[PDB]
Design goal:
- The structure is cut from a larger assembly and holds 10 protein chains of 7 kinds.
- Helices cover about 30% and strands about 15% of the residues of chain A.
- Chain A contains 3 helices and 3 strands; from the N terminus they run ααββαβ.
- The longest helix of chain A has 10 residues.
- The longest helix of chain C has 20 residues.
- In chain C, helix 9 packs across helix 10.
- By secondary structure, chain E is of the alpha+beta class.
- Chain E has one domain.
- Chain E is built from 2 helices and 2 strands; from the N terminus they run H-H-E-E.
- Chain F contains 2 helices and no strands.
- Classes of the chains: A alpha+beta (about 100), B mainly beta (about 180), C mainly alpha (about 220), D alpha+beta (about 550), E alpha+beta (about 80), F mainly alpha (about 90), J mainly alpha (about 130).
- The interface between A and D is large, with 67 and 76 residues.
- The complex binds zinc ion (ZN) (3 copies).
- It is classed as transcription.
- The entry lists the keywords RNA Polymerase III, transcription.
- The entry is titled "cryo-EM structure of human RNA polymerase III in apo state".
């Protein structure tokens, strides 16, 4: 929360983020913008990119194509809030290992 | 224990287990995974046969573990249509009977067992088979039975709902077990 | 055109023709004209199978082709013509109501093979009637060709564009004559049924029925 | 019973994201529950949710007292479910208004076919199929085709004259047709007029008003006007057939978002609960939907039904934008409500307010003080702040007797831990309410322990108004009991400090692997040269020079 | 097989290798150095690099997609 | 603006709303019963026709002695490349 | 050289940035209420997540910096281990 | 679909083009409530159009003149889109029954071909009763039902297709190629 | 290219906010 | 998980028998049963499979004898699959062989069946 009377924290804007990018450090940037800010686990299907639950899709009705990812709560918030504007964000999961 | 199928998955290794051979570690981790599971269609996995080819390991930034993608062959339980197997009858129902195998514990045979079967549940589970063509035969079946040879037909595959049988087989009585064959 | 008729022709091409042919047929309805290479690329089916499907489609006068800018072949699938496969029984029955089984059987295989020669269909129906008969296994070829020339002179079975470069130019003339046949080899001439005549006859029958039930049964005869 | 094989894969990432609009049938397929009731809370003893309502617990719980229904969990382990609402009368869209008023000029209104030539259509589709197509190149092609289609008012396929398409009011489309000029008499317009002269036998006030009689396109006729368009002319209309479709542009099925996306607020001043404005607008739309159905069986005038239809179409239109201008005075609302577009726009938004900001914890800020008694990469941390901040670490074989002494000391004394986490069980326990002599004994390998900040830790120290990349640096932490920030005056030039009223802040990295990245790249000894010129920025202060 | 890439060890890869080795040591991993009593395994993660006893291979990817394998012991570490 | 029209529903509408009128039966005639069997035999001979490809999948797993039931007697028709696009060369 | 490689002299404005980059998400903060957002759903283009700002918004490790190269573990492993025979299935014994 | 009561009003508004909502009450002797209900049900299914006539440049739907008109061309062109979906549903239902009992029909046809061949060489009564005993009552009642079902469906496809020809002949007559 | 103004078109960011301290004395959380 | 071949490399029951006899023989000596559930599942599977294969009278045969039996079966006609299906059980009784082959009354004769019956009873011990 905002303010020191409500036991809140500090804000890290782009002014300091550009300085972290100029150095070339990426692990520290994701550690203190995603790990200590908002860390959430979300399940996504590869065939049809959508938000499921407990590793189970309701559009394709299949449990085979399923995976999990770490997405900040703000990103999932925006993704679930943009669905009311007649816009469906379909993600495409690619193999990072191969 | 009829067919062996090849599979491929990425298997992570704990960072403290860097003293054993990677081969046996991967084999144990993959034998622990697929022990008592049916995946979608191939059938019920029994055990792991061996790995075919072993690829390299990767260290992703942030986790510190090691991910390796290996191809392994596991023995699955998937018999063909015209196959006869023996089972020990567990219980009797008004719609067929529930006979199970050693590890696979759900077989139900439908009313299509004989030409004149009789089913009636008054107090216990009983089965009558009369046979009047040229003489009088009356075979009586009780709470427990054993050594029943039958064919598996109508193999079904159901997907489990998010948390109730993913694999189900029905059979026609071929050789009730004194031995009398029915064709 | 619209998704409904596209889905209808999908099932009509999957039930009558093969699924491999049905895929290439339904892919040719959404796109007006496309070369064969890009078609095989989009559909994803092997070249031999798409070639077989294209020959199957062009044999039933369902898909046409034209030569474009340099030498390219652009195909066009006409779904309005393929939606008339549920009236084949009505067509055969309306050929049978006035004529006899000869015309019915000569128009049965005419819409099952598309472009076909008359000397072949007459021999086919002749051997078929010989096989179904028991005592008299004799079918005059002249009696069979009489029904064909009768369909010809009253304009039920016309001639397709004959053969007059990467591709041959398709051209049609207004000379629907019947070449002199021999009964005991005439190639380059194929006949096909005219659906326009069938639609005109259906319109006349509908008008006659409407005026028959309108006021009197006698004025239908005059009209 | 046997368990089905279910395992998740981690070696996957998102590569591309394709945008697209869903159709009512897919909306219902994805939806879980259908609301039919307008009452938010049931009229029972205590506050309880109503089934098949706007505030239902089947889309996701919002509090710490009621579990979920779909999958038994809490709102922390819950994503959310959607619903579908059937609309009696189809409504227009506020963002897809320019698109539909353009499409109405593109295709005809009686034939549903593009107004182009066979040769020009081929020339255009040839330009369409190209291996390289940017988003800025398709922006101008639509306008290039629209003028070419609007130049000709008569189509070449059929022989009907369309006219033009213009908008009016706020959501109203009038097709400019049946033009009456003074050069040539048309049979169509004369038949149209004489077909109206038979209706002047009852009311004498329709003949002078007949000259302004035209075609008024309503969502109903546009619905089948979008369903009669051939699918072969869709690719040339600059519309991806895979993602979108000409049909699903009219709102027919409303998508209810999850309840976890719209939290409710409570004020402890007069026992006042206030739901989200989204929920109020949804429950207001439901009350406007059944009055049209009841008016049908009851029987009202055509104007009484058109007014309710327009009100239902306007209330859902202000639900997303809520900033539309040019609204009727009688229909103008007095209260100000924010919608989805207003959740996006604004300084207090979600794009540059939450995503870009993303404020983090485990930090502080305090006035700096001079102290030329440390090194160049050292900084003094107050004891009060060091007691608040905590660093988690896993216990190794060499970290057994180093953490046991710390947990034996306690949280009251500076060297010590506060939270203890187990190896398998993911739970944290306090060290103030429980015992410390026993926790040191029950210690195994792979246990997370959060200890207080000690000397020799990579800490980040920077000011708010950063200009260059040297405004943030990392130093070594040192505990000093003076309740103030202290650091060497040599590094005052990179921070551009004045040492009179400056308030400098400090961050503590949480991940051990990232602790090494701030020591090699964001190093005080390493960063002594400036990238712009190449001169050393840390030399001395005027006092040292003198 | 010929390497046409500079043999000098970049600081960008040095820092990531040090962080990965420190995080792996913090997971009760078999250490390959004679360490005495000291805390902060990150401090001794550099000790193994100074003695060239780090079993980590660096894979450098090219814009086209070529992979180049390099050893930490083969890289030149100069301070 | 809003008149006296409060309505509250608890049971969601039925999946299949009860219809009011039933459909009207069709006519019957010798032509109709003839065309029924005609279309049936037409579909039957279209299934067993060389134009209908019956080897897309051929998903065989275990071979047996009854090959006549697995495979079908299929022939090829005259391609007639003369009255056909010369580019297509099978 | 940044405004000289692709075409002519391009300026650093709101219109030239749309010609340089092709990401709608970064333009979402520059532009206004819903124009681009609705035209994106209308046209239906695919946004590639390969930008540093996109990696920070999404939460993916960025390419530039310390995320270009990839690490590799080294231990004892065999490329192709010996296989186990299949005594029953032999082609010479089947005569197919 | 609706009834003769509404067909009378449909033909009434077809005769008198652009009729008023207040004047349909005395022309067509129908209770006002049911008349309005049926009129709105006909408006909801897009069977006739609604024209608006204002008195000012702005709409003002409150103070405006609404009229109901009938367009047979649009109704014909829209039922031409409904008959195709009807045929599609009929074909789907006809193909749905063939895949439900395909194994049972192929196992009942296989047991008939083996006896049709042996009956040529010699038929014995016991073997003839053996085949009647083999196929059970639900195994022999499936074919009798599916035959009637597919017959009804194939007889309905022709009856819904002839309507297409009656409806596609009026669309092309107004169509003029220019 | 339209003659627009940088101030009204480009909305104020954290860049614009001039962090300066002046005397200016005298939501659901879970 | 991705599958390369579903129906391939069909093995017999004695194969998994001899694979499972020595699988747990060295596992009990080396492994100390650390994991509870992951190891108990494998133990139950192994025990049930071993009991089911021991109840079947097919464990007393060497692979050389199996190869000789396959050489004897590859001779006349029957089937690549029925060769292994007949090996899983004992064809001692003559009515059971009529159920093994779907149509054995028209394919072969009674004496050709009895000869093979004698040869397989001389092979399979009791
Ligand atoms: Zn899915
Ligand atoms: Zn839930
Ligand atoms: Zn037109």
């Amino acid at each position: 929360t905002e303010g020191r009377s409500r036991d809140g924290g500090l804000r890290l804007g782009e002014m300091e983020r550009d300085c972290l990018i100029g150095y070339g450090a990426s692990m520290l940037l994701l550690e203190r913008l995603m790990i200590s800010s908002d860390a959430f686990e979300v399940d996504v299907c590869g065939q049809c990119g959508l938000l499921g639950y407990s590793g189970w899709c309701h559009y394709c009705k299949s449990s085979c194509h399923v995976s999990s990812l770490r997405i900040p709560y703000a990103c999932k918030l925006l993704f679930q809030e943009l669905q009311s504007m007649n816009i469906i964000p379909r993600l495409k999961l690619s193999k990072y290992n191969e | 224990m009829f067919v062996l199928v090849e599979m491929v998955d990425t298997v992570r290794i704990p960072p403290w287990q860097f003293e054993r051979k990677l081969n046996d570690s991967i084999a144990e981790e993959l034998n622990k995974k697929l022990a008592n599971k049916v995946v979608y269609n191939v059938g019920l996995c029994i055990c792991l046969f061996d790995i075919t080819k072993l690829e390299d390991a990767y260290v992703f930034p942030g986790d510190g573990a090691s991910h390796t993608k290996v191809h392994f062959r596991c023995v699955v339980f998937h018999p063909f249509l015209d196959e006869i197997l023996i089972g020990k009858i567990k219980g009797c129902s008004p719609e067929g009977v529930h006979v199970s195998l050693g590890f696979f514990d759900d077989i139900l045979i439908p009313p299509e067992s004989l030409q004149q079967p009789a089913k009636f549940d008054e107090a216990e589970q009983v089965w009558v088979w009369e046979y009047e063509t040229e003489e009088g035969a009356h075979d009586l079946y009780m709470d427990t039975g054993e050594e029943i040879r039958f064919r598996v037909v109508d193999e079904s595959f159901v997907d489990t709902s998010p948390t109730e049988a993913p694999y189900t087989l029905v059979g026609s009585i071929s050789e009730p077990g004194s031995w009398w064959t029915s064709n | 055109m619209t998704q409904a008729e596209i889905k209808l022709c999908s099932l009509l091409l999957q039930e009558h023709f093969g699924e491999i042919v049905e895929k290439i047929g339904v892919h040719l309805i959404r796109t007006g004209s496309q070369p064969l290479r890009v078609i095989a690329h989009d559909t994803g089916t092997s070249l031999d199978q798409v070639k077989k499907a294209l020959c199957v489609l062009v044999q039933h006068n369902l898909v046409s082709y034209q030569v474009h800018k340099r030498g390219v072949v652009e195909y066009e699938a006409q779904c309005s013509r393929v939606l008339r496969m549920l009236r084949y029984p009505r067509y055969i029955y309306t050929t049978k109501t006035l004529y006899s089984d000869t015309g019915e059987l000569i128009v049965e295989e005419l819409l099952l093979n598309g472009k076909l020669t008359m000397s072949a269909v007459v021999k086919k129906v002749a051997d078929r009637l010989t096989e179904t008969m028991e005592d008299g296994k004799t079918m005059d070829y002249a009696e069979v060709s009489n029904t064909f020339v009768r369909l010809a002179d009253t304009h039920f079975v016309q001639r397709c564009p004959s053969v007059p470069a990467p591709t041959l130019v398709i051209n049609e003339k207004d000379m629907y004559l019947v070449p002199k046949l021999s009964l005991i080899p005439d190639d380059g001439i194929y006949w096909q049924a005219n659906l326009d005549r069938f639609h005109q006859h259906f319109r006349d029958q509908a008008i006659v029925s409407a005026v028959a039930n309108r006021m009197d049964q006698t004025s239908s005869e005059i009209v | 019973v046997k368990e089905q094989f279910r395992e998740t894969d981690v070696a996957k990432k998102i590569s591309h994201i394709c945008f697209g609009m869903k159709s009512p049938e897919e909306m219902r397929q994805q939806a879980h529950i259908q609301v039919v009731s307008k009452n938010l809370y049931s009229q029972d003893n205590q506050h309880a949710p109503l089934l098949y309502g706007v505030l239902d617990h089947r889309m996701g719980t919002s509090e710490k007292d009621r579990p979920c229904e779909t999958c038994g969990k809490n709102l922390a382990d819950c994503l959310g479910h959607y619903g579908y609402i059937d609309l009696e009368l189809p409504c227009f869209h506020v963002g897809y208004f320019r698109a539909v008023i353009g499409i109405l000029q593109m295709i005809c209104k009686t034939c549903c076919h593009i107004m182009l030539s066979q040769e020009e259509k081929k020339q255009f589709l040839d330009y369409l199929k190209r291996p390289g197509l940017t988003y800025l190149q398709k922006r101008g092609l639509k306008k290039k085709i629209s003028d070419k289609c609007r130049k000709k008012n008569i189509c070449h396929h059929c022989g009907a004259f369309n006219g033009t398409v213009k908008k009016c009011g706020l959501l109203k489309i009038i097709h400019e047709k049946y033009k009456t000029n003074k050069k040539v008499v048309d049979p169509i317009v004369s038949n149209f007029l004489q077909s109206f002269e038979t209706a002047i036998e009852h009311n004498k006030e329709v003949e002078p008003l007949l000259g302004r009689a035209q075609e008024n396109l309503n969502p109903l006729v546009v619905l089948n006007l979008f369903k009669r368009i051939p699918a072969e002319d869709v690719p040339l209309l600059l519309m991806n057939p895979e993602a979108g479709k000409p049909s699903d542009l009219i709102l027919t099925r409303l998508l209810v978002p999850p309840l976890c996306i719209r939290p409710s607020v409570v004020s402890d001043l007069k026992s006042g609960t206030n739901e989200d404005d989204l929920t109020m607008k949804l429950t207001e739309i439901i009350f406007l939907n059944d009055v049209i159905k009841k008016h049908r069986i009851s029987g009202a005038k055509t104007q009484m039904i058109m007014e309710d239809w327009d009100f239902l179409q306007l209330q859902c239109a202000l639900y997303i934008n809520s900033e539309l201008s040019g609204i009727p005075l009688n229909m103008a609302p007095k209260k100000w409500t924010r919608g989805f577009v207003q959740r996006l726009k604004g300084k207090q938004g979600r794009f540059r307010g939450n995503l870009s900001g993303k404020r983090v914890d485990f930090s502080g800020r305090t006035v700096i003080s001079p102290d030329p008694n440390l090194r160049i990469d050292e900084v003094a941390v107050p004891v009060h702040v060091a007691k608040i901040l905590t660093f988690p670490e896993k216990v190794n074989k060499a970290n057994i007797n180093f953490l046991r002494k710390l947990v034996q000391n306690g949280p009251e004394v500076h060297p010590g831990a506060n939270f203890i986490q187990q190896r398998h069980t993911q739970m944290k326990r306090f060290l103030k309410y429980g015992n410390r002599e026993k926790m040191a004994q029950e210690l195994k390998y792979g246990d997370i322990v959060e200890r207080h900040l000690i000397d020799g830790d990579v800490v980040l120290f920077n000011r708010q108004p950063s200009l260059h990349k040297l405004s943030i640096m990392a130093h070594l932490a040192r505990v000093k009991p003076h309740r103030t920030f202290r650091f060497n005056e040599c590094v005052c030039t990179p921070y551009n400090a004045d040492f009179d009223g400056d308030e400098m802040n400090l961050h503590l990295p949480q991940t051990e692997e990232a602790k090494a990245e701030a020591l090699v790249l964001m190093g005080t000894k390493a960063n002594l040269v400036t990238p712009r010129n190449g001169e050393p920025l840390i030399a001395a202060i005027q006092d040292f020079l003198t | 097989q010929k390497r046409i890439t500079t043999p000098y060890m970049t600081k960008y890869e040095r820092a990531r290798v040090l962080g990965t080795r420190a995080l792996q040591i913090a997971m009760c991993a078999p250490v390959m150095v004679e360490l005495e009593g000291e805390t902060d395994p990150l401090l001794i993660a550099m000790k193994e690099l100074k003695a060239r006893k780090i079993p980590i291979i660096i894979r450098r990817y090219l814009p086209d997609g070529s992979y180049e394998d390099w050893g930490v012991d083969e890289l030149i570490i100069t301070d | 603006k809003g008149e006296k029209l409060p309505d509250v529903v608890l049971k969601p509408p039925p999946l299949f709303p009860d219809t009011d009128y039933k459909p009207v039966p069709l006519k019957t005639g010798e032509g109709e019963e003839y065309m029924l069997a005609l279309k049936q035999e037409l579909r039957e001979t279209m299934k067993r026709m060389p134009y209908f490809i019956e080897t897309p999948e051929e998903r065989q797993d275990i071979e047996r002695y009854s090959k006549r039931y697995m495979k079908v007697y299929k022939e090829e028709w005259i391609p007639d490349w003369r009255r056909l696009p010369r580019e297509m060369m099978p | 050289d940044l405004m000289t490689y692709k075409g002519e002299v391009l300026g650093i404005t709101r219109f030239g940035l749309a010609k340089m980059k092709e990401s709608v998400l970064m333009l979402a903060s520059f532009e206004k209420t819903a124009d681009h957002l609705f035209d994106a759903a209308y046209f239906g283009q695919k946004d590639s997540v390969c930008g540093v700002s996109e990696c920070i918004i999404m939460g993916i490790p960025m390419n530039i910096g310390t995320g270009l190269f990839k690490l590799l573990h080294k231990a004892d492993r065999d490329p192709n281990p010996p296989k186990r025979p299949l005594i029953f299935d032999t082609n010479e014994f089947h005569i197919p | 679909r609706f009834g003769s009561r509404c067909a009378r009003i449909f033909r009434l508004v077809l005769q008198k083009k652009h009729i008023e909502q207040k004047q349909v009450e005395d022309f067509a002797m129908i209770p006002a409530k049911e008349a309005k209900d049926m009129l709105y049900k006909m408006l909801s299914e897009n069977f006739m159009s609604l024209q608006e006539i204002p008195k000012t440049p702005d709409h003002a739907p409150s103070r405006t003149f609404y009229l109901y008109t009938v367009n047979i061309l649009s109704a014909a062109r829209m039922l031409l889109h409904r008959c195709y979906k009807s045929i599609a549903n009929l074909i789907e239902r006809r193909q749905f029954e063939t895949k439900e009992n395909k194994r049972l029909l192929e196992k009942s046809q296989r047991v008939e071909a083996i006896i049709a061949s042996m009956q040529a060489t010699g038929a014995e009564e016991a073997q003839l009763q053996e085949i009647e005993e083999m196929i059970t009552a639900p195994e022999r009642q499936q074919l009798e039902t599916l035959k009637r079902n597919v017959n009804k469906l194939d007889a309905s496809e022709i009856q819904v297709d002839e309507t297409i020809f009656l409806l596609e002949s009026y669309i092309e007559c107004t169509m003029k190629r220019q | 290219q339209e003659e627009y103004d940088e101030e009204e078109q480009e909305e104020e960011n954290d860049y614009i906010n001039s962090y300066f301290e002046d005397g200016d004395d005298f939501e659901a959380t879970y | 998980m991705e599958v390369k071949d579903a129906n391939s490399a069909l093995l017999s029951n004695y194969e998994v028998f001899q694979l499972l006899t020595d699988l747990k023989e060295q596992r009990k000596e080396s492994g100390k049963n650390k994991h509870s559930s992951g190891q108990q599942n494998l133990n139950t599977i192994t025990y049930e499979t071993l009991k089911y294969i021991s109840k079947t009278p097919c464990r007393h045969q060497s692979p050389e004898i199996v190869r000789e039996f396959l050489t004897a079966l590859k001779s006349h006609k029957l089937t690549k699959a029925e060769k292994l299906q007949l090996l899983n059980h004992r064809p001692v009784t003559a009515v059971e062989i009529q159920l093994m082959v779907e149509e054995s009354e028209e394919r072969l004769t009674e004496e050709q069946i009895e000869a093979l019956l004698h040869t397989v009873t001389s092979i399979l011990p009791a």
